[PDB]
Design a protein around this nucleic acid. Structure first.
Lengths: 142, 144, 66, 141, 100, 75, 55, 185
RNA sequence: ACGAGACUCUGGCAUGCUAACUAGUUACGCGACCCCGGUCGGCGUAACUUCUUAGAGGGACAAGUGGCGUUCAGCCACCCGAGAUUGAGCAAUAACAGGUCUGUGAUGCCCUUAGAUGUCCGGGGCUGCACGCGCGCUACACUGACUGGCUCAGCGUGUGCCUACCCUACGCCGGCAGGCGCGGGUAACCCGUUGAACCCCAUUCGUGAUGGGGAUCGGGGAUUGCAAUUAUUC
């Protein structure tokens, strides 16, 4: 029917994860491979918080094709969390009302604020005279 | 299979060199001089010898089947770049020594360097670092 | 550690002693006023100067200021 | 129906190793039994047909991104050159062990050359690769 | 007919004002215009010692060159652009016209 | 210092001390049965793979670094 | 005789074949970007070639 | 399940917090539920942002120790997740309850300090800091040069700490520190 | 009056503005493959700026409330919020016998100036080793080593006025170092979608100076250079 297109971007430490939604059926897959088929597979329950704290019925009318690039291993895993949780918010704003959308934001606000508000932490610059951002070289007396 | 069999071995005194029987075959052979780890796996590959067993199940007549490859790897299609003595100075015999010739050939290249008054060999006489190491700050234990 | 200096305070009194009717109470209101009645060179100072004006307005409505 | 992308990759690289068991006609080289994978390694691998394992990983890598040549194969199959006394550097794989796989899969038609160079997967090789992608998924359901 | 003009400079105010003034001469003749593409900037990096000899505490430098480039396409002949490339040019901007 | 002379391969009593006594423990891992029965860690794992085909231990978590075993279900 | 034993070394490589253009010494040379200038001659003339200590 | 949470397969509910002195510093229930013992971070910036952290994540945050294993949270969660079953296959009960009796019983009440030493009381947040710490370095030597893996030593000690059986490192160092404080008290 | 502040560059938020066939996406249309749907850095197209990039702007002020404070300067707390202190640069008055005449065609003064402390060519040394000291690196293992598999980046540089000397894909030859033939990149183009490690998964080892450690040292092979022996590296 009508083209219900939502493409929500969400950053991470460096990682860029962009979605693209449509009125589909219950399939969620990132870069073509599904979300449980992402290694490391110890973080498998970290990609089901939008699936579990909302329920599967929120994705009965939603398909999402996620393009991700950049970052690290864990940085990608956290980028692909806040990029699809935010995506279903805008799909439940442009097309359905916000009273059915605030009922899935108030659940999202009591667990973790990273899913909707990204981290403003960025790695500080290493200065001269030290191996790290704050660490200086070992001083020798005498 | 699982329990200690009969004809068990703890020590394989082969090529007058003691080989422990507790380890895996491909890693027990490192006791012999002239064989480390990489040369050890491939010689076990040049015959169909099982290596997921220990050094205490392998039968007797085929540990000699190991040996026929050991001193002569040439006729069992092992290349020259595996050898510890490639292109020998006198005859050009691409050979492999195993705990007999190694120290025996070792007191020859000393005098092939010492008689000829070579700068490389003179450091072996004194016992200093020969490969061009900074000697001012390192190597203190051996020299007092 | 947020203590204003003279140029935040000597200027903000010139905003009050000459432009009283042209301001209100809300910050962003007289922030948008002070840009046109005063040439402040930077943006961060533009938020700085007007920020002291609203705080002193919270005093003038409540009492006399020296 | 499902493709290779619906399958966990850990139990895929031995699945394609199983399809070459019924083949036995890849003209496997001679020095495979006494060779190290790369200069950053120092041993040989553990499985006897590791050449049936590393070749089994190339076709799925050529599924994801094609036109890859001999220099693009050594980077992915390389590893950390643990230099020991020095801090480490990264090291690519051996050039020949990649060149003998893309020559093994030119013996049997499973890979073609891309225009302006490269090595990419063929459609009839994508026919039967989507058959071993079913034998893994139908077994775990 | 598809001509490309490069706009590259150092000072941001020197390149931003001349890109728009060259747009102003383009709409007057009302021709096939393209907009300004802003490619990522190149920054030359030099960090060196402050001291001439090797005495004192160790302090370094932060020399920078944030150079910027803009390209503009036109479906215009080489004649009418030569009436625009003769006006409104500041010497800090480097222009190389690509005929084809 | 002190030698932990582990058994490289079983005896006829030690393996017989495995077919009945290991299914009595509540915790079976290659790090304790090798220490409780003085065998190598290689022999420890290779003492339980047959028990899978013997069905005298139950697997609940196999991993790269950690595999644990127990009794069977009590019934 | 003479002329074949004064510059007869190969002078196409090495640090005896490169030098500064301003300081004319062979230490601390900035051979980056075709600068070819010593690092102390770089400091005083950093404004003349155009550099700015922006950071 | 948007109503209840399963820690992998471990239930969120039925953990009674015994001590009332630490229950305001154990964030373990109904407001602090996570499927993983891993968040993005952010807990270590403010003064008292360390009080509402999930305790199982706190132990992993303290486990990545001694150089080579710093910055490797990907595998210490692979240690405690394996170690949680080890507690269950020895007890049969909730393994997280064993941790509750572990941090309760391994936190010293009084502690001498440089003032001549004056033995003084400690904060509950100091107490949960030390109780989680003394076990975390105790198992660090139990797997050191030993066939017993780090997964078991992490699981073995809090089992021995929930009963206070005094064969763990954390119990011994708690009562000696309470006694050497009892000297100059 | 200076310094502090302010100021600058960067870090974070703006589905608003401006536009991108050397940036990406969205579709549509085939090709391939599985049972309409599924996938593809396979291939073209018109709409877009979400991601690409950087231009303008906008955004935070102790602003609002609640305590606290002369109720002044201010401080503590809450909420809304992408931010309720990003990081650096710049940095005074006066001072040191701090250091550099080995950065100079910056130099006073002094020595030397043809059998030259000037200049170049050969070779050696600056690496030399009873000993003490400083910054370091890899380690001392099982949270490990070792072997397969799986999979993630972000900063830069590249054909030189001299300069005869570049970054590199691809195709073969060889276990490797390396070698040969074509093509592109003066660069958001080619390298490069920069397939980095750590990692993750699964083997193997099993508390043993062991498969931890790689110091020492012998033998063979290639690159750079006119030249590597005092082992240039590999």
């Amino acid at each position: 029917g009508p083209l219900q297109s939502v493409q929500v971007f969400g950053r991470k430490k460096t990682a860029t994860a962009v979605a693209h939604c449509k009125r589909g059926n219950g399939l969620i897959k990132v870069n073509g491979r599904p979300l449980e088929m992402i290694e490391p597979r110890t973080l498998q329950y970290k990609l089901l918080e939008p699936v579990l704290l909302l329920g599967k019925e929120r994705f009965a009318g939603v398909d999402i094709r996620v393009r991700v690039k950049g970052g690290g291993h864990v940085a990608q895993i956290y980028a692909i969390r806040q990029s699809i949780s935010k995506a279903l918010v805008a799909y439940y704003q442009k097309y359905v009302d916000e009273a059915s959308k605030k009922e899935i934001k108030d659940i999202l606000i009591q667990y973790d604020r990273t899913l909707l508000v990204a981290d403003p932490r960025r790695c500080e610059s290493k200065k001269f005279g030290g191996p790290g951002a704050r660490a200086r070289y070992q001083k020798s007396y005498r | 299979s699982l329990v200690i069999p009969e004809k068990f071995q703890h020590i394989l005194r082969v090529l007058n060199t003691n080989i422990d029987g507790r380890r895996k075959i491909a890693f027990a052979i490192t006791a012999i001089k002239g064989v480390g780890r990489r040369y050890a796996h491939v010689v076990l590959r040049k015959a169909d010898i099982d290596l997921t067993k220990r050094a205490g199940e392998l039968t007797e007549d085929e540990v000699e089947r190991v040996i026929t490859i050991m001193q002569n790897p040439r006729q069992y299609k092992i290349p020259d770049w595996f050898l510890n003595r490639q292109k020998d100075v006198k005859d050009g015999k691409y050979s492999q020594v195993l705990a007999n010739g190694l120290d025996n050939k070792l007191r020859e290249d000393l005098e092939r360097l010492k008689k000829i008054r070579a700068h490389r060999g003179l450091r072996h006489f004194w016992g200093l670092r020969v490969r061009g190491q900074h000697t001012k700050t390192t190597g203190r234990r051996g020299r007092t | 550690g947020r203590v204003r200096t003279k140029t935040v305070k000597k200027a903000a009194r010139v905003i009050i002693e000459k432009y009283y009717t042209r301001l209100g109470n809300d910050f962003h209101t007289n922030k948008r006023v002070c840009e046109e009645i005063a040439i402040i060179p930077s943006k961060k100072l533009r938020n700085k100067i007007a920020g002291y004006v609203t705080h002193l307005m919270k005093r003038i409505q409540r009492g006399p200021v020296r | 129906g499902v493709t290779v992308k619906d399958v966990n990759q850990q139990e895929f690289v031995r699945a394609l190793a199983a399809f070459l068991k019924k083949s036995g006609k890849l003209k496997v080289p001679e020095w495979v039994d006494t060779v190290k994978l790369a200069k950053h390694k120092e041993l040989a691998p553990y499985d006897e047909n590791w050449f049936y394992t590393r070749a089994a990983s190339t076709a799925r890598h050529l599924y994801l991104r094609g036109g890859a040549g001999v220099g693009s194969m050594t980077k992915i199959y390389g590893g950390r050159q643990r230099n020991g006394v020095m801090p480490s550097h990264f090291s690519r794989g051996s050039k020949s062990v990649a060149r003998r796989v893309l020559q093994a899969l030119e013996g049997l038609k499973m890979v073609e050359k891309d225009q302006d160079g490269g090595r990419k997967l063929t459609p009839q090789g994508q026919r039967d690769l989507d058959r071993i992608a079913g034998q893994v998924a139908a077994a775990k359901k | 007919h598809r001509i490309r003009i490069t706009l590259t400079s150092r000072n941001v105010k020197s390149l931003e004002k001349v890109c728009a003034d060259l747009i102003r001469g383009a709409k007057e003749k009302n021709l096939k215009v393209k907009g300004p593409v802003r490619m990522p900037t190149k920054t030359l990096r030099i960090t060196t010692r402050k001291t001439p000899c090797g005495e004192g505490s160790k302090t370094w430098d932060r020399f920078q060159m944030r150079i910027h480039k803009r390209l503009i396409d036109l479906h215009s002949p080489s004649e009418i652009v030569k009436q625009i490339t003769s006006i409104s040019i500041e010497p800090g901007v480097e222009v190389e016209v690509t005929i084809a | 210092r002190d030698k932990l002379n582990n058994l490289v391969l079983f005896d006829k009593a030690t393996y017989d001390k495995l077919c009945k006594e290991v299914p009595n423990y509540k915790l079976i891992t290659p790090a304790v049965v090798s220490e409780r029965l003085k065998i190598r860690g290689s022999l420890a794992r290779a003492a339980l793979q047959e028990l899978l085909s013997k069905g005298l231990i139950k697997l609940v978590s196999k991993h790269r670094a950690q595999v644990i075993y127990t009794r069977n279900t009590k019934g | 005789g003479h002329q074949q034993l004064y510059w007869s070394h190969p002078r196409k490589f090495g640090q005896g074949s490169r030098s500064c253009r301003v300081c004319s010494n062979r230490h601390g040379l900035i051979r980056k970007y075709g600068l070819n200038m010593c690092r102390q001659c770089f400091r005083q003339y950093a404004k003349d070639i155009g550099f700015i200590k922006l950071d | 399940t948007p109503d209840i949470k399963l820690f992998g397969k471990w239930s969120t509910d039925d953990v009674q917090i015994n001590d009332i002195s630490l229950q305001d510093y154990i964030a373990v229930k109904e407001k602090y539920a996570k499927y993983l013992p891993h968040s993005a971070g952010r807990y270590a910036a403010k003064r008292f942002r360390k009080a509402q952290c999930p305790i199982v994540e706190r132990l992993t945050n303290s486990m990545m120790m001694h150089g080579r294993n710093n910055g490797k949270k990907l595998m210490t969660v692979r240690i405690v997740k394996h170690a949680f079953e080890i507690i269950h296959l020895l007890t049969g009960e909730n393994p997280l309850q064993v941790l509750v009796n572990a941090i309760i019983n391994s936190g010293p009440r009084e502690d001498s300090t440089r003032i001549r030493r004056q033995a003084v009381d400690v904060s509950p947040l100091r107490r949960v800091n030390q109780a989680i710490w003394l076990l975390c370095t105790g198992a660090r030597e139990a797997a050191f040069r030993n066939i017993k893996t780090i997964a078991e030593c992490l699981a073995d000690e809090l089992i021995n700490a929930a009963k206070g059986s005094s064969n763990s490192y954390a119990i011994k160092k708690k009562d000696e520190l309470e006694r050497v404080a009892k000297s100059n008290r």
